[PDB]
Structures are given as C-alpha cells and as structure tokens.
Design a protein around this motif. Structure first.
Motif, short mmCIF file in Angstrom:
data_model
loop_
_atom_site.label_atom_id
_atom_site.label_comp_id
_atom_site.label_asym_id
_atom_site.label_seq_id
_atom_site.Cartn_x
_atom_site.Cartn_y
_atom_site.Cartn_z
N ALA A 160 43.98 22.81 50.76
CA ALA A 160 43.27 23.47 50.03
C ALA A 160 42.72 24.59 50.78
CB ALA A 160 41.98 22.29 50.15
N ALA A 208 42.76 27.79 49.51
CA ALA A 208 41.27 28.78 49.14
C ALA A 208 41.79 30.13 49.77
CB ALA A 208 40.21 28.39 50.01
N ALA A 212 43.20 32.69 46.80
CA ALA A 212 42.49 32.43 46.18
C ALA A 212 42.05 33.88 46.60
N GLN A 213 42.01 34.18 47.67
CA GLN A 213 40.87 35.44 48.00
C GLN A 213 42.02 36.37 47.89
OE1 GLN A 213 39.29 32.49 47.99
NE2 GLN A 213 37.71 32.67 49.45
#
Length: 11
Positions: free
Chosen positions: A1, A5, A8-9
C-alpha cells in the motif's frame, strides 16, 4: 500500500 500511495502521487 505504501508503494501504491506514493506512486499515485508521483505519477
């Protein structure tokens, strides 16, 4: 995860 994350950024 954590890796999910961050990218994604990043992207």
């Amino acid at each position: 995860a954590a890796l999910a994350a961050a990218l994604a950024q990043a992207l």
